[PDB]
Amino acid sequence: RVMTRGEGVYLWDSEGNKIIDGMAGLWCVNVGYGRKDFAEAARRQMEELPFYNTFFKTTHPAVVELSSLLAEVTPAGFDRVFYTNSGSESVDTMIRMVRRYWDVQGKPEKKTLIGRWNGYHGSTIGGASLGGMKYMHDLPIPGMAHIEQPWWYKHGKDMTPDEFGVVAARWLEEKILEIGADKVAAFVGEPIQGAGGVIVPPATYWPEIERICRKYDVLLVADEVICGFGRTGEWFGHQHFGFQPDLFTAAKGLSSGYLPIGAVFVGKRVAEGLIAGGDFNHGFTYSGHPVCAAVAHANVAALRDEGIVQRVKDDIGPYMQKRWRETFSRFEHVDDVRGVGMVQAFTLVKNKAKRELFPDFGEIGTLCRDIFFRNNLIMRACGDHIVSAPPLVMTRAEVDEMLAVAERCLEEFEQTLKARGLA
């Protein structure tokens, strides 16, 4: 069984089946499939000028164009961009940048980065260490610490979500104080944890994280691997949650996955420090594969000029979120129905009233995912969390089509749970 074609939100196979890609490839095909204009952009750039050379003191014009456009859509203060080939490379570079920044400041001890259990930051040795996947962890490398994730369903006890957000953020303060602030370089997090299961923190979480980072002279880093380029309805997830990172990382969402690329966006304060040190100046000037940059430029231009991101914020996001909640909330073994913009999720649970999870977390998720897949719907299981992140161009009719298939699948899921004595 082989894939033949993609268009919009659909994939087709050699047997003629139409498949709804409810995950937009690897959470990244934000403009959808079938952009022949991107192929033309790549073709043109490769025929004309696919290289630049450091012999010249100038930046390749395709990269200049991309950076200029990016500046218009990123938050204030992020004019300095260091391009990479992937989100994993972006995270790795960010780690080195954070540590070098503190060296330049005359604080060589300030080297520990803090992440979270169930956080994911790619697959380099550095990124895997900063991530908090139990299986991935030798690992972690030195100068890496972790705090618990803001997963209310599991850790909330009898706290309201807002109370819990403050408590979960204060775990960062506890860890900083345990290590000593003089040894802590940065806190890094995905605005919404992606691979961990679309863990959406309470509204009080990020502002308290930021208060803590600022109090203790710790840098704040957003990993926009999944939340970037319109996924939440804002251009970047940190904008939705209302925090101001000092740097943020981006992955191939920058090109909707059509060519490999990533970036580190470096805010004014950290950029000034890095440039004083000099170690990243070559990359600030010369980074960025020009062919990948031309495609990324076409992608970002489409996201803005075709109204795609604005439509997530104003139209399809709120529609998806309401329809998602209307569809899944009634099921006996579905809880914590959640989402923002065009990322959404729920958790398969043994007992909603008790907030009791199934044992062997992941086994039931796999069972449900297999039902979706049999019905030609791609949604992903992260443990027993079911997640979705379709192309942002999905229409209201396509949302409703996807939800109708998922609804049918959940009916079968509930029936199967019962039949197997697992309900």
Ligand X SMILES: C[C@@H](C[C@@H](C[C@H](CCC(=O)O)C(=O)O)C(=O)O)C(=O)O
> Which of the choices a copy of itself, ligand X, none does residue 149 contact, using the CB cut-off of 5 to 8 A by kind?
none
Interface region with ligand X, contact rule CB under 6 A, candidates 40-48, 119-127, 239-247, 352-360: 119-127
Interface mask toward a copy of itself for 170-189; x: CB under 8 A: --------------------
Interface mask toward a copy of itself for 238-257; x: CB under 8 A: -------------------x
The closest of 131, 110, 112 to 120, measured between CA atoms, is 131
Among 45, 74, 88, 129, binds ligand X (CB under 6 A): 88
Q: How far is the CB of 336 from a copy of itself (least distance, A)?
A: 25
The closest of 196, 263, 233 to 392, measured between CA atoms, is 233
State yes or no: 68 annotated in a binding site.
no
Does residue 21 belong to the site contacting a copy of itself (CB under 8 A)?
yes
Distances (CA, A) of 170 to 116, 146, 166, 204, 403: 13, 13, 6, 11, 37
Among 89, 246, 335, 336, binds ligand X (CB under 6 A): 89
Q: What is the C-alpha separation between 268 and 81, in angstroms, rounded?
A: 11
Positions in 67-106 near a copy of itself (CB under 8 A): 85-86, 88-89, 92-93, 95-96, 99
Q: How many CA atoms lie within 13 A of 117 on its CB side?
A: 9
Angle (CA) 118-21-419 rounded to 5° is 75
Among 15, 16, 51, 134, binds a copy of itself (CB under 8 A): 51
> Which of the choices a copy of itself, ligand X, none does residue 196 contact, using the CB cut-off of 5 to 8 A by kind?
none
What radius of gyration, in Å, describes the C-alpha atoms of the chain? 22
Interface mask toward ligand X for 120-149; x: CB under 6 A: --xxx-------------------------
Establish whether the linkage from the previous residue to 140 is cis, with ω within 30° of 0.
yes
Does residue 416 belong to the site contacting ligand X (CB under 6 A)?
no
Q: How far is CA 239 from the centre of its chain?
A: 13
Q: How far is the CB of 128 from ligand X (least distance, A)?
A: 8
Among 118, 124, 239, 249, binds a copy of itself (CB under 8 A): 124
Does residue 224 belong to the site contacting ligand X (CB under 6 A)?
no
> Which of the choices ligand X, a copy of itself, none does residue 40 contact, using the CB cut-off of 5 to 8 A by kind?
a copy of itself
Cβ(112)–Cβ(144) under 8 Å? Answer: yes
The closest of 348, 388, 423 to 153, measured between CA atoms, is 348
> Which of the choices a copy of itself, ligand X, none does residue 72 contact, using the CB cut-off of 5 to 8 A by kind?
none
Which residue is listed with tokens 């319109």?
A: 230
State yes or no: 285 annotated in a binding site.
yes
State yes or no: 58 annotated in a binding site.
no
Phi, psi (5° rounding) for residue 84? -135, -175
The residue length of the chain stands at 423
> Which of the choices a copy of itself, ligand X, none does residue 207 contact, using the CB cut-off of 5 to 8 A by kind?
none
The closest of 375, 350, 344, 351 to 365, measured between CA atoms, is 350
Residue 19, burial from CB neighbour count under 10 angstroms (0-12, 13-18, 19+): middle
The closest of 174, 388, 233, 392 to 302, measured between CA atoms, is 392
Structure tokens at 238: 């940190």
- The annotation places the binding site for pyridoxal 5'-phosphate at 87-88, 285
Positions at the binding site: 87-88, 285
Positions touching a copy of itself (CB under 8 A) are: 1-6, 11, 13, 19, 21, 25, 29, 33, 36, 38-40, 42-43, 46-53, 55-58, 60-61, 85-86, 88-89, 92-93, 95-96, 99, 111, 123-126, 128, 138, 141-143, 257-260, 289, 291-292, 373, 378
Interacting residues toward ligand X by CB under 6 A: 84-89, 92-93, 122-124, 251-252
